[PDB]
């Protein structure tokens, strides 16, 4: 009778084919080569397969390669192989919506995973870590862009801010794994990283918008700076209200408490993210989600474990989609060897300066050498925000119909995709490798 590897592979192949077949039967034309749903399904499966395959390979002392690399490569190959790309087409609206949902999921997970006492202690350190390295890297990257690539100063800073914020999608899962393992919990390193990795996005996007407006001489800088400040304020206020609400109302004496709480947090986070994006305040949604989830977890205390488990399953489902879509954004047209060497040089030097700055920001915080080194190497990952706003400058330049500005926007896009590819895999691998060693386990 059936047993062993053959039965498992038969069942998995059957489930995959059956899911596609069911979707095709219900929809029909969407789930066929060229249609949207067929593209989504194929991208999902390819991302999962790539993650697994890359995870398999482990020859050297370094742990198995991160599945992030596999998912990114799957998306990249789907985008760039000619015929596969022609057949597998995903509508932009759907891709953006799925990526937004994945971001909301991970932000909720991070907010739930925070520790109140650690946050109360590492108060200034979080602000420094969130706002120092981003600014310093933006400035140094602008310098490099002006001198090497030849961009003017405004475009240099646009590039520096695009090549800015760290990615919560990469940092949060690894820090949650480490926190579950108990590494660095005594000093609350995972809490510090998870909290700081969700604020610098606001500063990076604010700087990007301001410098873009300066470059195209549109609107005013004061308006964009005030937009950033209002983003912070309204995000905090809305998150606080929602968190204090869901922290009380689904009561401890209801029939399906876990399900209702999970739906409330996830739905409120999705609503915040999408409505804020649609209302012209992209960045208030993430902060509102973080604060809401933090307050809800603080209120629930022990009961939050089941909600965390369900959201972890949701993230397991959604991570392949997010990273496959990010990879599918990358096009080899922008990675032409015309000047790719200089773009790589600027990205590498900016990353080195970012590492040094991050080490100096957490210097006077009570950490020891190993913890500071781990923190510096855990601030590298960049993704899910370089892909979101990488090509905005190029689109604006095209709208203005200026050739020089198109050239500058193309350099910006090349550098964004470079930074993603270079830093996300190495960053995740370094987090995984250096977690157990440098951090101090608590048992």
């Amino acid at each position, epitope marked *: 009778p059936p047993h062993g590897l053959l039965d498992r592979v038969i069942t998995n192949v059957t489930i995959i084919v059956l899911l596609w077949a069911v979707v095709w039967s219900i929809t029909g034309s969407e789930c066929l080569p*060229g249609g949207n749903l067929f593209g989504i399904i194929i991208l999902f499966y390819c991302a999962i397969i790539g993650g697994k395959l890359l995870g398999l390979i482990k020859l050297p002392t370094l742990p198995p390669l991160p599945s992030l690399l596999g998912m990114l490569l799957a998306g990249f190959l789907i985008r760039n192989i000619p015929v596969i*790309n022609d057949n597998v*087409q995903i509508k*932009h609206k759907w891709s953006s919506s799925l990526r937004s949902i994945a971001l909301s999921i991970i932000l909720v997970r991070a907010g739930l995973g925070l520790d109140s006492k650690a946050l109360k202690k590492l108060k200034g350190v979080c602000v420094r870590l969130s706002m120092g390295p981003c600014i310093v890297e933006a400035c140094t990257s602008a310098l490099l862009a002006h001198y090497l690539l030849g961009l003017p100063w405004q475009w240099g800073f646009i590039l520096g801010f695009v090549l800015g914020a760290v990615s919560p999608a990469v940092v949060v899962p690894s820090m949650l794994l480490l926190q579950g393992g108990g590494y660095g919990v005594e000093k609350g390193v995972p809490t510090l990283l998870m909290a700081a990795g969700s604020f610098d996005d606001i500063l990076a996007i604010t700087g990007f918008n301001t410098c873009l407006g300066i470059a195209f001489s549109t609107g005013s800088t004061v308006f964009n700076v005030l937009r950033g400040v209002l983003e912070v304020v309204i995000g905090v206020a809305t998150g606080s209200v929602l968190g204090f609400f869901i922290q009380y109302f689904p009561s401890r004496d209801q029939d399906k408490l876990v399900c209702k709480r999970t739906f409330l947090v996830l739905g409120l986070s999705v609503l915040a993210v999408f409505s804020s994006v649609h209302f012209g305040f992209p960045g208030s949604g993430g902060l509102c989600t973080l604060v809401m989830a933090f307050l809800a977890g603080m209120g629930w205390t022990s009961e939050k474990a089941e909600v965390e488990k369900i959201i972890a399953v949701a993230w397991d489902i959604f991570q392949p989609l997010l990273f496959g879509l990010i990879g599918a954004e990358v096009s080899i*047209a922008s990675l032409r060897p015309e000047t790719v060497g200089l773009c790589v040089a600027t990205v590498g030097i900016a990353v080195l300066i970012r590492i040094l700055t991050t080490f100096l920001m957490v210097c006077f915080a009570g950490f020891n050498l190993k913890e500071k080194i781990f923190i510096s190497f855990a601030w590298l990952p960049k993704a899910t925000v370089q892909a979101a706003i990488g090509s905005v400058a190029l689109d604006t330049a095209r*709208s*203005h*119909g200026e050739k020089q500005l198109e*050239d500058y926007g193309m350099d910006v896009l090349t550098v964004a995709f470079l930074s993603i590819l270079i830093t996300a895999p190495i960053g995740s691998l370094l987090i995984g490798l250096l977690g157990p060693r440098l951090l101090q386990k608590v048992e």
Partner: antibody
Amino acid sequence: EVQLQESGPELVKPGASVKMSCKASGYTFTNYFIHWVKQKPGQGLEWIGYINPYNDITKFNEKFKGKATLTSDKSSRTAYMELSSLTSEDSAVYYCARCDGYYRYYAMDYWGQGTSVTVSS
Amino acid sequence: DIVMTQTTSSLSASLGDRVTISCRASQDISNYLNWFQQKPDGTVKLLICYTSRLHSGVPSRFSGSGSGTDYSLTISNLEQEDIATYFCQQDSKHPWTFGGGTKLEIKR
């Protein structure tokens, strides 16, 4: 090889509308910009507008803003242009050329064959 | 706009000489002065992108000199094939504007 083939010669009456077709083979269709150029006989060329067959965004010369309408279909790998309320001044050869949007020295470098449009009664 | 002007609309040239085509813009395009060739049968092919960047597959005779706002195109030696109409384009600004064109006519 790369080739763009467009519809054949057309005959129309004043005030009517015509659909131009430009189909390209030999390259990733959604990887390039499709530009339209109108050459009236005797006179020189003059740019009309372009369509991005990736997100279907367009840009039009101010002169043809409203007179023309660009569309594309990825599955058929073809692009179409609509000329509305044709007059005596809209009878000329129409070209379609591709252009790499993500190259610092982009140009057209690949044109159609020319689709004469005649607006007579 | 950036209406371009080609000084000579029809210049004679033998079958073994070097000819020059002059294109002058009504502004300062940095170097975005593509060149095009249209043959009498109506087929138009790119020749020179970005002033002097010879295109791929173009014979080495075509030399796209010129800079500033007074560009030019040169033919090393003239072959019977090179008898056609040559347009100078500009993509520096939004509305791309072609030149008036020039026709090469064999001397006799």
